[model samples]
Target chain A: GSVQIVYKPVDLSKVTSKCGSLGNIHHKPGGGQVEVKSEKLDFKDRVQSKIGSLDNITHVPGGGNKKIETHKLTF
Target chain B: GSVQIVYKPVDLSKVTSKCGSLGNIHHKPGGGQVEVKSEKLDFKDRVQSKIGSLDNITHVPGGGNKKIETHKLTF
Candidate 1:
């Protein structure tokens, strides 16, 4: 069956770093792009967040993919 | 340059809450909206997760934003 598609805009300004090697901090503001794709739609029923795997491409000045880190995203 | 945006539907059934003060729980099923905006595109090569923050507007019956807690999201 075809999957129902939905799109929601995420405000980067509210993103906070709380896990992983990266300490708790706010991300810098700049041109950034996020693409979410999943074989199955993962949605959280308690806090009302969605969890899935997708390809994210970020462009920061003077920064390469090396600067990028993995963090859990919520909707 | 123009930013490329892609939208995906979340199953709202596979989200697991880990880490943070909140225990692992599933989000409630309902109509919720998430908005993502970034200055640059940040992409994670491993696990294929993107790190960016966008404004998330959730509409849960009898609950307000106060009930909502911030958690890391991956997609």
Candidate 2:
């Protein structure tokens, strides 16, 4: 069967490259997360909230609720 | 640029088939949600928590945090 993006895991490779380190969380029994981290507070805030991941991140808000800056999006 | 799934709208066609109707949520700024509804409670529980959708659904505790059943899934 094909993978459902809903439960798909968020990749942290690029996030890790930018922050040098990344923290990830897979909500039990399935998939979830897009947590990025860095030593700089400014940089951390710049990444927006969360896309996924679990547990409250100390620096960034608990989730990736930040709207990714974009030009096109449909509701 | 291309589209990031994080901010992508989840396709509800398949989900809609499973239930009589489907509810969706576009978390402000970016993407979010996977709320399904029906007239039955057992059916409601079958959909799991949530993947994304807005506010409290009458039956679905809240959210499609529910993992779709599958034999193949990787962390």
Candidate 3:
């Protein structure tokens, strides 16, 4: 398998970092074959509204309608 | 800067992939300095319960209490 970033297990209830509410949700079954589609929130209001809370809740921007590519991504 | 994965933009309303609800969120401000912590769902029931809907909504396991590290990660 190629080099895939594996995030350590941390309790979401006790997250204490600056970008505490931001992170990735990976498909464990993919075995490092997952891909992410990102769009930068250029506006401060959009960014703030997008990431309103610092809770460990997942923030699916654009209503989670983002397309997913199962094809193996190369670095 | 290190190698980073940038997810493309897709509409949540028209997603048609297998893992449509699975992906990553990047901190645009961090450049390539973001990190993700992942935990696999061993039980099918847990996995099913965790990923209930296929909508583009973000699912934050562990009640959004996960700790985040601001340090840069190497590939």
Q: Candidate 3 DockQ category?
A: incorrect
Interface RMSD of 3: 28.5
Candidate 2 CAPRI level = incorrect
Per-residue CA lDDT of candidate 1, range B17-57, in tens? Answer: 12222222223322233334334443333233323343222
Residue B24, candidate 2: Cα error in Å is 27
**What is the C-alpha lDDT profile of model 3 across A1-75, one tens digit per residue?**
333454332222321222213335533221112222334312222121121112233442222222222323333
TM-score of 3: 0.12
Return the top candidate by lDDT.
Answer: 1
Quote the positional error of residue A51 for candidate 3 in Å: 66
Superposed Cα deviation of residue B62, candidate 1 (Å) = 28
Error of 2 at B71 (Å): 49
The residue ranges of model 3 lying beyond 4 angstroms of the native Cα positions read A1-70, B14-75
Output the number of the TM-score-best candidate.
Answer: 1
Worst 10 residues of 3 chain A by lDDT: A44-53
What TM-score fits each model?
A: 0.15, 0.14, 0.12
Off by over 4 Å in 1: A1-28, A42-44, A50-75, B1-51, B54-75
User: In model 2, where do residues sit more than 4 Å from their true spots?
Assistant: A1-75, B1-29, B32-35, B43-48, B53-75
